[PDB]
């Protein structure tokens, strides 16, 4: 069916033209068991105050646009009380729910690829050098891809067909993905569990997964139609818990 | 049997409302359409299997990971032994096979292939006994030997193997020796909590070093030797498969690249020839 | 100790013997005959089970 | 103070107090100037990996008429080290009242994301800091020595583990000993 | 017995000369039941990250000192994550545990009265006027009493024998109280439950209770002894829960 | 399983008279305080073990104990063979590991690693057969060979092993051969009853000698060889653990030292940086 | 003669075989799987058993 509703915390999300819900690699986000845990102290578990939908900034799908990416959970640094527990606790563990919505018309056309890339290590633009943190993820805005080659000395290689990683951009469909076809679809929701090699990790020096939105089939329309087609991203943490409470840093 | 492939059940003509070919990729779903939905097929008993395509049969083949040379000369004591910070990034044929998966957990056999020669110049040997090599593994933080004939070559706790030339290659087994629960091939993050330092997997690689030397002075001439290390991962579990790499590697500590074309060119979009 | 297992032959004296000599589990031979698979996690990672003959949308 | 007996002693004093730290060191039991040469850290240098929870016991060796209260804090490594008792009270801390029982065990928990930490640590497997601050201060009667001495102890709990034997980088030689 | 230990969260408090534990008006701090609750939405319940011991600032008991007061929960505005949930949630409900410690000597003497006054409405110093909020409670320091009459136009009447409320200072012993006699006692711990007329209340415009420390028998000593006797207050919230999550204000 | 570590049982808040943190070190007692007494913990199932930290896994690793050289020349018959009064004090890496315990009782495997070379000079060999070495153990009091080609190299009762170059290293097993009931690493006492003589462990070391030689004359040139002895103590029981050593060793028969600092320096007492 | 014992594996065909070939007990392999311990002799070497929760003095 095409109508869904996802209620988390004090916030709901209603859609009327939905494809389905892709759920990670099969499993649902849950809490850390006693069989796998290694932190000795008691973990905190804020149910409603942390696990709720946060709406990020809006971008503009232009006719010459090529792609964007957000790195998580760094994109929700100043989003409510989820970002306040990250500063006070040394450890964190959470799953997510990534709702991406872009409605245009019956007369517009286009396509998007919404992947969630775990451990998306990204390559620099000047080889024999290294990126900096200010070039990987902005504070709330989207870092975009470039159609041509990136010339910078400390930026990500933001070419689009190599996906910023050195791999084929068509082969990104292994990861949990949907497609926003403006002919059939309106929104794309992806539920990602906690994917890491360690049971918990500090969510300041480790981007857990990267959300990429890439238009494979570009946007065209007619001059009678609208000329502003925005994309909005709404991400909710799910089953979040923390350890290691100390002073806030930073700040 | 195990683990065979599915058979094609026989099919006749049809006129149905249940069309299986028409689907929707927008849900992020790969279709389960077998050939019996779009054409008439016959009952064949497919006896093929996928034993050669499992994870354990794909990775349990030894590959070279380093090539190290060392002398037996006098002077320049850095050439009298070789060093290796343990990596799986220096030789590309095993680096690309590992980097189809994000995480990996396995045991390993490590085979050392040492092959020597006689160095040229005046005052050659003309009668030499066999050579013997000591291949010491230093876990992270141990005493590093500054040269050959050092106190750190005693190795009361470091595992060392002694090997005379002419016999079978040396081989031992190593368990899953990581700190975490999987060898992270990719690490999207930093080393310091202030988002500064070393971006990438090079901060997670803390496995130790490998040192190899001649335990014999000789006293007449020089003989170089070439240690080649071979890695065979066994008892392998793997998680989160990645796309295979497209651009060629540049560095042994980075995923840095230069942007390459997606495929090789062809003449036309409809180029069924020739 | 004699773990008699079957060899690899193609479907149209097939048994072998194996002893574990060393005291460590990492010393064993490779597990070349574990042929499980579960491709539904990447092919069908949905919340609702999708039928082929029924329409998707 | 390393070529004398004064390395093992902690100075505490009188007036007024409490805008001063008592001591402070990183939590690195295998690689530190503080406690790699103790009984716990000597056996740790024979191994590469370590895990578990570490105890710290503090004896007050002042006079029997001296009072006092201290704050014994431990901080996870996520943020900057604390500079006063307002930043150090948020971490794991106990409050030690000096009385008839003259010892207090500050038990550092095992909080990390990995099951094991390296002995020769780095920026990845850092464990944090251990600080000590005045809660109230020393109050001595007239005729008593105004300054005292705290001793520090370190041992392992019953869930400590080591792994991956290696040689210690602690002893060396050049030739054979005759 | 004289030795106790109170463990809450990742923090313990050890004492060796204790009187007892006064527990409010008999009852223990608990969570809000479903029989009495009026907020419809799900409440958050941070166990370890909020309910732990917070050490306030230290004061100096001089020989001419007369008293201090702290208003709660305004004194823990910038104390950890307890103060971060107060800004994000419109409603709050918590009990407390007030440990006050002051060790001097066998040769010092003095006494203190540690009361917890629910709804301690305080009178201005200029009658036919009204106090301001900056004169009732500082950001972390203690507001003190004055031995003489207060002359200010917008301050609390900080005379000590009227206790700043208009009542007798000897009759403050109805409230949950202990005494720090330096002859017999070292610390004073008081467990206060949630006392209000409403089930929950916004903890910015309503000081729930005021902690007062008043020396009835003053401090004297000899010149050989120490001349700095400080008092330290350590307060832990207990069974804290919140409702009404909106934007942070303030700030 | 065996031998795992204890789990942390879950803990809530408390207000008790039973304080477990306050203790007294004056009784000479190390406290049994687990983290559940001073903070709230959660139930984790700790699956770690202490198999790698036992006595047998700590000492059953071979370490070098001697390095001995000998010739095949003509003239100076003391260089034609090597000697060793059997010690565990000459190489430091095994000396420090033994000296964490006062007493020790074990069996042993002894591996000989011999590595030769060709000595320089005129009249070289240019065609030599393989070398063979005889490694005779003389229990205390036996006939000492004065040189190579002696009558004492018959060894009708002394255990000798003959080893050609090019094969695997020689290895045999030795039981607990002490006079007492434990190898005393430390001996606070004298040798004579009048409190005179040899103070220390050097009077208790009566284990015999080890002699190694070439059994072949050659008749043309000189070839030096280097015997390296390796000790692996197995079936180990140990008693009365000692503090590990601080100052570096000087002598092979003494605990004499020079007074060293207790640790390395740091900038301040409160030096949490950087 | 076939002393079938268990290998070393980590808790989330594990048996090996061992023969004693030589006539001496010092000829055997190492006793690497004897994991007993008794730390009470050095941690609690007291005459009276001390309780944690009860005060020492
Ligand atoms: C002289 C005795 C040599 C003993 C040989 C042991 C040395 C090798 C130990 C390390 C090998 C473990 C496997 C390492 C794999 C890579 O590090 C991972 N893919 C990266 O995390
Ligand atoms: C040519 C055949 C050689 C046979 C090899 C046997 C010689 C070695 C016998 C002595 C080794 C026994 C172990 C000795 C240990 C130390 O002496 C003790 N730690 C000191 O008391
Ligand atoms: C150290 C391994 C030696 C070879 C194993 C002993 C010879 C084969 C015995 C076969 C029966 C073993 C008992 C079962 O399994
Ligand atoms: C000298 C040792 C030769 C090898 C041992 C004989 C072959 C294995 C026999 C297995 C059954 C032995 C009886 C039991 O134990």
Resolution of the structure, angstroms: 3.4
Chains C+G touching (3+ CB pairs under 8 Å): yes
Check CB contact under 8 Å for F235 and G28: yes
CB-defined site of ligand 1, < 6 Å: B 86, 88, 104, 108, 110, 135-137, 159-161, 172, 174, 177, 183, 205, 207, 210
Q: How far apart are CA A204 and CA A74, in angstroms?
A: 7
Contacts of residue B49, Cβ cutoff 8 Å, sequence gap at least 6? B1, B2, B3, B4, B5, C35
Q: Which residues pair with D163 in a beta bridge?
A: D49
Residue E246 and residue E204 in contact, taking contact as beta carbons nearer than 8 Å: no
Q: Which residues pair with B163 in a beta bridge?
A: B133
Within 10 angstroms of residue A71's Cβ, the number of other Cβ atoms is: 21
Q: How far apart are CA F221 and CA F187, in angstroms?
A: 47
Parallel, antiparallel or unpaired: strands A18-23 and A187-192? parallel
Query: Ligand 3, from C4, C5, C19: best to mutate by most atoms within 8 Å of Cβ?
Result: C19
Chain F interface includes D37 (CB < 8 A): yes
Q: Which atom of ligand 1 is nearest to the CA of B212?
A: 1
Check CB contact under 8 Å for D159 and F7: yes
Within 10 angstroms of residue B39's Cβ, the number of other Cβ atoms is: 7
Helix (H), strand (E) counts: chain A: 1, 12
Q: Which atom of ligand 1 is nearest to the CA of B87?
A: 17
Give which of E121, E100, E120 is closest to E112, Cα–Cα: E100
Candidates F11, F41, F44: best to mutate against A (most CBs of A within 10 A) is F44
Residue of F nearest to A34 (CA): F44
Within 10 angstroms of residue E39's Cβ, the number of other Cβ atoms is: 16
Q: Report domain extents, chain D.
A: 1-178
Q: Which residues of B touch C44 (CB under 8 A)?
A: 29-30, 32
* Beta-strand runs (E) in chain A: 4-8, 11-15, 18-23, 54-60, 68-72, 89-101, 113-118, 143-144, 177-179, 187-192, 209-214, 230-245
Give which of F5, B194, A206, C28 is closest to D115, Cα–Cα: F5
Chains that touch F (3 or more CB pairs under 8 A): A, B, D, E, G
F38 min Cα distance to partner chain A (Å): 10
3-class DSSP assignment, residue E169 = helix
Parallel, antiparallel or unpaired: strands A18-23 and A177-179? unpaired
Chain A interface includes C47 (CB < 8 A): yes
Residue A97 and residue A28 in contact, taking contact as beta carbons nearer than 8 Å: no
Q: How far apart are CA A198 and CA G50, in angstroms?
A: 39
* Sign of torsion over alpha carbons B229, B232, B236, B241: positive
Report residue F182: phi and psi, to 5°: -165, 140
Both tokens of residue E83? 């103060």
Q: Which ligand is nearest to the CA of F175?
A: 2
Place of tokens 């210690």: D168
For residue B172, the CA-to-ligand 4 centroid distance in Å is 26
Residue nearest to ligand 2 atom 18, measured at CA = F183
Q: How far is CA D165 from CA A62, B86, B208, D48, F198, in A?
A: 60, 17, 12, 6, 36
- DSSP secondary structure code for residue E109 in this structure: B
Q: Report domain extents, chain E.
A: 4-245
D107 min Cα distance to partner chain G (Å): 14
First-to-last alpha carbon distance for chain F, in angstroms, is: 42
Q: How far apart are CA A123 and CA E187, in angstroms?
A: 60
Chain A interface includes D79 (CB < 8 A): yes
3-class DSSP assignment, residue E96 = strand
The dihedral formed by the CA atoms of B150, B154, B157 and B163, expressed in degrees to the nearest 10: 110
Both tokens of residue E2? 């004289």
Give which of F52, F25, F65 is closest to F174, Cα–Cα: F65
Give which of G31, G27, G4 is closest to G17, Cα–Cα: G4
Q: How far apart are CA E48 and CA D85, in angstroms?
A: 20
Q: Residue A80: is the preceding peptide bond cis (ω within 30°)?
A: no
Q: How far apart are CA E118 and CA E100, in angstroms?
A: 18
Domain span at residue F123? 1-274
Buried b (16+ CB within 10 A) or exposed e, F15-30: beeebbbbbbbeeebb
Q: How far apart are CA B167 and CA B164, in angstroms?
A: 7
Q: How far apart are CA E230 and CA E69, in angstroms?
A: 15
Q: How far apart are CA B236 and CA B238, in angstroms?
A: 6
Check CB contact under 8 Å for A49 and E46: yes
Closest by Cβ to D167, choosing from B155, B191, B206: B155
First-to-last alpha carbon distance for chain B, in angstroms, is: 42
For residue C5, the CA-to-ligand 2 centroid distance in Å is 46
Q: How far apart are CA B261 and CA B150, in angstroms?
A: 52
Domain count, chain F: 1
Residue E230 and residue E59 in contact, taking contact as beta carbons nearer than 8 Å: yes
Buried b (16+ CB within 10 A) or exposed e, F190-209: eeeeeeeeeebbbebbebbb
3-class DSSP assignment, residue E156 = strand
Residue nearest to ligand 4 atom 1, measured at CA = G21
First-to-last alpha carbon distance for chain E, in angstroms, is: 46
- DSSP secondary structure code for residue C47 in this structure: S
* Topology of the domain covering E4-245: Jelly Rolls (2.60.120)
Chains C+E touching (3+ CB pairs under 8 Å): no
Residue D43 and residue D155 in contact, taking contact as beta carbons nearer than 8 Å: no
Q: Which residues of F touch A40 (CB under 8 A)?
A: 8, 35, 41-42, 44
Give the method of determination.
cryo-EM
Residue nearest to ligand 4 atom 9, measured at CA = G1
Residue nearest to ligand 1 atom 6, measured at CA = B137
Q: Which residues pair with D133 in a beta bridge?
A: D21, D71
* Sign of torsion over alpha carbons D45, D49, D54, D56: positive
A181 min Cα distance to partner chain B (Å): 7
Residue F250 and residue F89 in contact, taking contact as beta carbons nearer than 8 Å: no
């Amino acid at each position: 069916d095409r109508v869904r509703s996802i209620t988390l915390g004090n916030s709901t999300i209603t859609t009327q033209e939905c494809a389905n819900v892709v759920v990670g690699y099969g499993v649902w986000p849950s809490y850390l068991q006693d069989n796998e845990a290694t932190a000795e102290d008691q973990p905190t578990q804020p149910d409603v105050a942390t696990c709720r939908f946060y709406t990020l900034d809006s971008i503009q799908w232009q006719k010459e646009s090529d792609g964007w990416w957000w790195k998580f959970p760094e994109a929700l640094k100043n989003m409510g009380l989820f970002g306040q527990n990250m500063e006070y606790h040394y450890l964190g563990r959470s799953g997510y729910t990534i709702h991406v919505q872009c409605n245009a018309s019956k007369f517009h056309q286009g396509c998007l690829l919404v992947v969630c890339v775990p451990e998306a290590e990204m390559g620099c633009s000047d080889v024999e050098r290294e990126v900096v943190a200010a070039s990987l993820s902005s504070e709330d805005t989207a870092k975009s891809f470039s159609r041509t080659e990136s010339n910078g000395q400390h930026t990500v290689q933001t070419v689009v067909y190599n996906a910023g990683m050195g791999v084929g951009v068509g082969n990104l469909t292994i990861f949990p993905h949907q497609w926003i076809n403006l002919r059939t679809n309106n929104s794309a929701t992806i539920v990602m569990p906690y994917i890491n090699s360690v049971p918990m990790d500090n969510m300041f020096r480790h981007y857990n997964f990267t959300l990429m939105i890439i238009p494979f089939a570009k946007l065209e329309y007619t001059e009678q139609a609208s000329n502003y087609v925005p994309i909005t991203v709404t991400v909710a943490p799910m089953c979040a818990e923390y350890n290691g409470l100390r002073l806030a840093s930073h700040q | 049997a195990v683990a065979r492939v599915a058979d094609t059940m026989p099919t006749g003509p049809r006129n149905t409302e249940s069309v299986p070919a028409l689907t929707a990729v927008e849900t992020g779903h790969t279709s389960q359409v077998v050939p019996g939905d779009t054409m008439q097929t016959r009952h064949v008993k497919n006896y093929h299997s996928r034993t050669e395509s499992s994870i354990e049969n794909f990775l349990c083949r030894a590959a070279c990971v380093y090539i190290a040379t060392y002398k037996s000369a006098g002077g320049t004591p850095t050439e009298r032994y070789a060093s290796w910070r343990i990596n799986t990034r220096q030789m590309v044929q095993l680096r690309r096979k590992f980097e189809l998966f994000t995480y990996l957990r396995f045991d390993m056999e490590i085979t050392f292939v040492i092959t020597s020669t006689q160095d040229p110049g005046t005052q050659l040997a003309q009668d030499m006994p066999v050579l013997t090599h000591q291949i010491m593994y230093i876990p992270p933080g141990g005493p590093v030997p500054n040269s050959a004939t050092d106190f750190a070559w005693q190795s009361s706790t470091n595992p060392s193997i002694f090997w005379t030339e002419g016999c079978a290659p040396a081989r031992m087994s190593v368990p899953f020796i990581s700190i975490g629960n999987a060898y992270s091939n990719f690490y999207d993050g930093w080393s310091h909590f202030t988002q500064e330092g070393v971006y990438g997997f090079n901060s997670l690689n803390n496995m130790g070093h490998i040192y190899v030397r001649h335990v014999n002075e000789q006293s007449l001439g020089v003989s170089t030797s070439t240690l080649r290390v071979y890695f065979k991962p066994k008892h392998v579990r793997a998680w989160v498969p990645r796309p295979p790499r497209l651009s060629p590697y540049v560095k042994s500590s980075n995923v840095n690249f230069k942007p390459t074309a997606v495929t090789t060119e062809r003449k036309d979009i409809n180029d069924v020839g020739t | 100790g004699a773990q008699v297992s079957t060899q690899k032959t193609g479907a149209h004296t097939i048994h072998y013997t194996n002893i574990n000599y060393y005291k460590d589990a990492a010393s064993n031979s490779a597990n070349r005959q574990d042929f499980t698979q579960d491709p539904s996690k990447f092919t069908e990672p949905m919340k609702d089970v999708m039928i082929k003959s029924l329409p998707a949308l | 103070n390393i070529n004398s007996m004064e390395a093992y002693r902690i100075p505490v004093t009188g007036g007024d107090q409490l805008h001063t730290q008592v001591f402070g060191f990183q939590m690195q039991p295998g690689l530190n100037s503080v406690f790699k040469r103790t009984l716990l850290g000597e056996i740790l240098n024979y191994y590469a990996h370590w895990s578990g929870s570490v105890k710290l016991t503090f004896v007050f060796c002042g006079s029997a008429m001296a009072t006092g209260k201290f704050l014994l804090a431990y901080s996870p490594p996520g943020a900057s080290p604390p500079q006063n008792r307002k930043q150090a009270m948020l971490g794991t801390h106990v409050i030690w009242d000096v009385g008839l029982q003259s010892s207090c065990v500050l038990c550092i928990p095992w909080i990390s994301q990995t099951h094991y930490r390296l002995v020769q640590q780095d920026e990845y497997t850092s464990a944090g800091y251990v600080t000590c601050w005045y809660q109230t201060g020393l109050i001595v009667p007239p005729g008593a020595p105004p300054s005292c001495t705290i001793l520090c102890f370190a041992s392992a709990c019953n869930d400590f583990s080591v792994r991956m034997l290696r040689d210690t980088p602690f002893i060396e030689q050049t030739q054979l000993l005759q």
